[PDB]
Design an enzyme around this catalytic site. Sequence first.
Site, PDB file in Angstrom:
ATOM      1  N   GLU B 280       0.823  -1.207   0.000  1.00 43.27           N
ATOM      2  CA  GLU B 280       0.000   0.000   0.000  1.00 43.27           C
ATOM      3  C   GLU B 280       0.858   1.260   0.000  1.00 43.27           C
ATOM      4  O   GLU B 280       0.534   2.236  -0.684  1.00 43.27           O
ATOM      5  CB  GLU B 280      -0.946   0.000   1.202  1.00 43.27           C
ATOM      6  N   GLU B 283       2.326   1.758  -3.434  1.00 43.51           N
ATOM      7  CA  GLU B 283       1.303   2.342  -4.297  1.00 43.51           C
ATOM      8  C   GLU B 283       1.052   3.807  -3.959  1.00 43.51           C
ATOM      9  O   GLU B 283       0.763   4.604  -4.858  1.00 43.51           O
ATOM     10  CB  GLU B 283       0.006   1.534  -4.195  1.00 43.51           C
ATOM     11  N   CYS B 300      -9.152  -4.010   2.511  1.00 41.92           N
ATOM     12  CA  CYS B 300      -8.899  -4.941   3.605  1.00 41.92           C
ATOM     13  C   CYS B 300     -10.136  -5.756   3.961  1.00 41.92           C
ATOM     14  O   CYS B 300     -10.136  -6.984   3.843  1.00 41.92           O
ATOM     15  CB  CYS B 300      -8.414  -4.175   4.837  1.00 41.92           C
ATOM     16  N   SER B 320      -7.715  -0.031  -4.298  1.00 43.50           N
ATOM     17  CA  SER B 320      -6.362  -0.566  -4.331  1.00 43.50           C
ATOM     18  C   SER B 320      -6.389  -2.043  -4.700  1.00 43.50           C
ATOM     19  O   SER B 320      -7.203  -2.812  -4.178  1.00 43.50           O
ATOM     20  CB  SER B 320      -5.679  -0.377  -2.978  1.00 43.50           C
ATOM     21  N   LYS B 359     -15.554 -13.049   5.311  1.00 42.26           N
ATOM     22  CA  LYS B 359     -14.544 -13.922   4.730  1.00 42.26           C
ATOM     23  C   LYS B 359     -15.151 -15.227   4.233  1.00 42.26           C
ATOM     24  O   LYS B 359     -14.587 -15.870   3.343  1.00 42.26           O
ATOM     25  CB  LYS B 359     -13.440 -14.197   5.747  1.00 42.26           C
ATOM     26  N   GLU B 362     -16.012 -14.320   0.996  1.00 42.47           N
ATOM     27  CA  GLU B 362     -14.791 -13.927   0.299  1.00 42.47           C
ATOM     28  C   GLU B 362     -14.046 -15.139  -0.249  1.00 42.47           C
ATOM     29  O   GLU B 362     -13.555 -15.119  -1.383  1.00 42.47           O
ATOM     30  CB  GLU B 362     -13.907 -13.115   1.247  1.00 42.47           C
ATOM     31  N   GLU B 367     -12.410 -15.583  -8.151  1.00 41.31           N
ATOM     32  CA  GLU B 367     -11.256 -14.822  -8.616  1.00 41.31           C
ATOM     33  C   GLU B 367     -10.090 -14.844  -7.637  1.00 41.31           C
ATOM     34  O   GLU B 367      -8.960 -14.548  -8.039  1.00 41.31           O
ATOM     35  CB  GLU B 367     -11.653 -13.372  -8.903  1.00 41.31           C
ATOM     36  N   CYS B 506     -12.804  -4.255  13.684  1.00 38.36           N
ATOM     37  CA  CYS B 506     -12.991  -5.701  13.713  1.00 38.36           C
ATOM     38  C   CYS B 506     -13.036  -6.267  15.125  1.00 38.36           C
ATOM     39  O   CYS B 506     -13.473  -7.408  15.303  1.00 38.36           O
ATOM     40  CB  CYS B 506     -11.889  -6.386  12.910  1.00 38.36           C
TER      41      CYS B 506
HETATM   42  S1  SF4 Z   1     -15.138  -4.089  10.717  1.00 40.76           S
HETATM   43 FE1  SF4 Z   1     -13.971  -6.014  11.034  1.00 40.76          FE
HETATM   44  S2  SF4 Z   1     -15.570  -7.643  11.002  1.00 40.76           S
HETATM   45 FE2  SF4 Z   1     -16.537  -5.786  10.115  1.00 40.76          FE
HETATM   46  S3  SF4 Z   1     -16.215  -6.011   7.880  1.00 40.76           S
HETATM   47 FE3  SF4 Z   1     -14.463  -4.772   8.659  1.00 40.76          FE
HETATM   48  S4  SF4 Z   1     -12.846  -6.308   9.089  1.00 40.76           S
HETATM   49 FE4  SF4 Z   1     -14.794  -7.473   8.879  1.00 40.76          FE
END
Ligand code: SF4
Lengths: 583, 583
Positions: B280, B283, B300, B320, B359, B362, B367, B506
């Site tokens: 990152e 970039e 992310c 990105s 995820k 994801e 891809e 998160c």
């Molecule tokens: S805040 Fe945390 S749990 Fe919610 S989408 Fe973003 S990375 Fe995932």
Amino acid sequence: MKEITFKINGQEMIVPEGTTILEAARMNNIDIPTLCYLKDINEIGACRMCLVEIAGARALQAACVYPVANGIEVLTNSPKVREARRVNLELILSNHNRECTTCIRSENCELQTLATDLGVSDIPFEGEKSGKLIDDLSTSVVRDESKCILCKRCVSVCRDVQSVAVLGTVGRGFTSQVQPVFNKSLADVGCINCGQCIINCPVGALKEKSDIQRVWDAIADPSKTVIVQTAPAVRAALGEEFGYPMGTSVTGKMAAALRRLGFDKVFDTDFGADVCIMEEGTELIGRVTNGGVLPMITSCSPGWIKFIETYYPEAIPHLSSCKSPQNITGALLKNHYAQTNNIDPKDMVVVSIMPCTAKKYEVQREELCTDGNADVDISITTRELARMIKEARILFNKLPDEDFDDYYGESTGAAVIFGATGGVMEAAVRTVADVLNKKDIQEIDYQIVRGVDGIKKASVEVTPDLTVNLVVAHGGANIREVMEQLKAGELADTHFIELMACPGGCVNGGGQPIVSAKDKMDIDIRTERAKALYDEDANVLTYRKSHQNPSVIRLYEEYLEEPNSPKAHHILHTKYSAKPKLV
Amino acid sequence: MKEITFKINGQEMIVPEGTTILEAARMNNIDIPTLCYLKDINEIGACRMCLVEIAGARALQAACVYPVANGIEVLTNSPKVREARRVNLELILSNHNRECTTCIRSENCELQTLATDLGVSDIPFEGEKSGKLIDDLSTSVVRDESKCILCKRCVSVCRDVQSVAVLGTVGRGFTSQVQPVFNKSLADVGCINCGQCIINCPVGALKEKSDIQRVWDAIADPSKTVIVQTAPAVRAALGEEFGYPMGTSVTGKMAAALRRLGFDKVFDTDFGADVCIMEEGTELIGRVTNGGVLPMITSCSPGWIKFIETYYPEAIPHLSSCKSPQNITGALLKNHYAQTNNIDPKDMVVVSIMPCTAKKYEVQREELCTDGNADVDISITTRELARMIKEARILFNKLPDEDFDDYYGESTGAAVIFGATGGVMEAAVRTVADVLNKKDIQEIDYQIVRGVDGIKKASVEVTPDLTVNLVVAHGGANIREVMEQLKAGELADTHFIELMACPGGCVNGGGQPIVSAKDKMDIDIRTERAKALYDEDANVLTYRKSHQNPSVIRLYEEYLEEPNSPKAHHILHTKYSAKPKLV
Ligand code: SF4
Ligand code: SF4
Ligand code: SF4
Ligand code: SF4
Ligand code: SF4
Ligand code: SF4
Ligand code: SF4
Ligand code: SF4
Ligand code: FES
Ligand code: FES
């Protein structure tokens, strides 16, 4: 002692002979599920939960009762083990009535914790559960057969620990059920209201007689004023309900919470307890000076005196004529407090938070009444008081502290030690020594009898002219042993024998909150409860002797004259009669 | 601010205007049962559980949304209140399926706590339930309408704090159910896989997609070796499962427990996170030096980028090409570790422990594969990790500590701050300042925008010739606001914006363990989790900067050459295409 070497899951160990793989893994930081296993009480292998793969074995073996062997290999995470556990839980759950919203146990049913732990979502197999037969007839214990898992813990406890054994198994297949003899009710046979059977069951098939509706009805009466009284042992374990660590004193918090319920007076059973300590000391003096019936035993706990009435009437001269400290303080409040307050005795309702469940039957007795008036009205246990507080639902963890009421809430340490085993007897001998010889003793050395644990013998010189023989007894089997010796007559020299049915003293009573097995393999709850109570004893800075309390001295001077007076005999002394047995 | 006087249950109190009675009782140490109430989110009075008597009122009122008034009298323990509460629990439980053995929520279902709390005896009011169907089709979220009790917390969460609102109410009477739009499935509409709807539901009607069976199948293979991947926010709230207090680190204990599970390799994502930060920053330098598309945003969290591609395709040039740190680490283990170990790439299975639930969608993306090989195979949340370790049943509270394997388990504080709010961008600006100007910064002052909390702005001189504009956003409504402002072009001068879909970062993700509203009222679990993570950051005594770690330096020198190489673009950079919308 033989040394056994065994290899499990990457780690080898040396253990003594007789070791089982279960507690060996517990020591080595591995857990295995248990239903029918109790430490040194029920080791039979009926649960069929704890299966582990054994090298060279045709099928699986149950780790609960499986003895260790040399050079073996054990693996505890095979797919076969997981599938067997899942299918076996599916099988056993098809009987237990799955409405777990309304079980008393609810949140801490060990079966429920296993069900969540194994994550077995589906139940493919239907069934036809056994006959529903609610035995809602006895005085203290209520049985439900829609829940029982045939764990066999209850029958083993009532057979071995209590030496009564009024429960057994009948039938074959689905007809196999646990019942009393002759298909009668529990109250129709020689049940002692031990309370161990109701506390040790891991499912909730047994419950206690609930009187919370009567309590709410009584408190709802504005015309009736309520007098609530507390045990020394309620703060010994109630904090465990709220997630507190073992050994927390919430006495002032308890007083505050009870005041938030709107109870008119809060009080302790301690004052009448000191009164009856003076009592038993007085007839000790009398029986020494008049050659009274010896050896002497107390009349404290309803359970074992019920047992003596039911099974061994021949020792009825040996009992104490005094009525229970509950009964003493109940009569005292219903008479002397009523006289001082000029209120009709029927206008008081007295409620007691005691840990024995035998008091449920004890209050139902016809003869424990004064002037034809009920000494106490409703008795409740610690668990159901906890659920009463929860339905009121005050956030208990932030309460401040409060004091007790005049005069009958004052406390002494020698009367604090009622909760542990022998504290009553300790206080009695300390007080009689202080009265008769001015002897200052704090503790008594005890002779541990070889081969029997829980029986305690002592003999300390009370006076140089009289050394009193002292015996302490807790546990139904110990009661049976000492009663057989008493019938044999080898205890002729003995003076006091203290008895309760519940082992370990009232901190291990039937009304104490339910605990699982895991903490029992970890720590003896009796030990921590006794340590908390003894620490409470060491902090009593007002008096370590009952006879020095100004309150009991005041009452004796003003209203009770001296013990063993005609008024004292008429109000506080009672006789017992043998009960018919249906065994 | 207006002062309101009220007299409740013997005590008078002053509150500001708008302070309803529930928190007034809370600060006065009195608790009231709540189902449909959430702090500052759901205030509607649908539950009708919290009834209290009001002086002069014809009937009872719900204390949840009842505003206080001057001179009122409130009684909380009338018999009418108790009877009404009991009958409403009896009514509401007649729809919820009483099979409480196998709910995922199980032990901590708030309905179970209330059912035990009120002590309901039996449910006489029988009947049939509403129509049922399980939408077991979506990638992540699973619905079971047989359980839900129309709490409306889920719909309020998905409408207000996420600004998505793909849930609504349909029908009349029994036909009234909460459902998606047009009778479709959750995956068929613009759901973002927020995870808030899962975490906030107080009954267990909603759950996450379970893949523990696939995990047990994968670990059962001896021909396949397993590499497990840990996020930095796993130990933020794991201890709460085992009764530990808030903010306990069990990292070495977790490593030991995972090793007891039979995993071959354990690794920490901090290495790949550091690599992503370098990519990152490279970039950053490129787009500064080549006039790249501005502003820069990360790639992310799968959730918000799913939201962007679903709703706002115009933001693709601003995105990105870098992949998520767990994805980059998985690809690195799939290629470089395979090259070093000379083991066929299909012969490894990589499992990841993510607090996101996005995820799960994801990894299902076609891809995100390298050379036709799956980068990572299975992803599981923290809650089902707790379930799998509980059924694995090792006594977690006595485990010792263990370390992580080389070279991809080493950690830096700049990567420790990954889970916390803004730490990724913090490390990025710190490292780019170190690279370009040798500037040593540890923390950056943040501008709190007036009227919106959770939107956060900063601008510190990275170099005297270039000051980088800095914005951090967490919360779906905040994402919507900043995206609307970006479309309006007000953020032309801005360079970096962080977007975290779940509010608070998160640490407050959908994979975190369930907590009750009682926890949420007094203390923010986000605050304690952030304090624990920051205390862990302050104890990182190896390196506070990513680029000083010898491991990333080694990998960049030996295998990665230079960041933004053609090999780096081919392995670590990807394109995203707009997905069709069915709204
Ligand atoms: S805040 Fe945390 S749990 Fe919610 S989408 Fe973003 S990375 Fe995932
Ligand atoms: S055994 Fe009793 S308490 Fe346990 S889950 Fe079943 S019904 Fe509920
Ligand atoms: S009460 Fe029922 S489940 Fe408990 S030990 Fe006795 S037979 Fe077994
Ligand atoms: S109360 Fe005592 S005697 Fe009666 S069943 Fe239980 S343990 Fe046996
Ligand atoms: S230990 Fe306590 S509950 Fe048990 S018999 Fe003795 S006094 Fe009663
Ligand atoms: S709501 Fe779900 S978790 Fe709660 S008791 Fe009912 S089935 Fe069990
Ligand atoms: S998930 Fe269902 S039951 Fe739970 S709050 Fe939302 S609508 Fe109500
Ligand atoms: S995952 Fe997000 S968008 Fe989907 S229902 Fe839950 S809160 Fe709404
Ligand atoms: S738990 Fe092992 S046989 Fe009972
Ligand atoms: S808590 Fe829902 S109406 Fe009050």
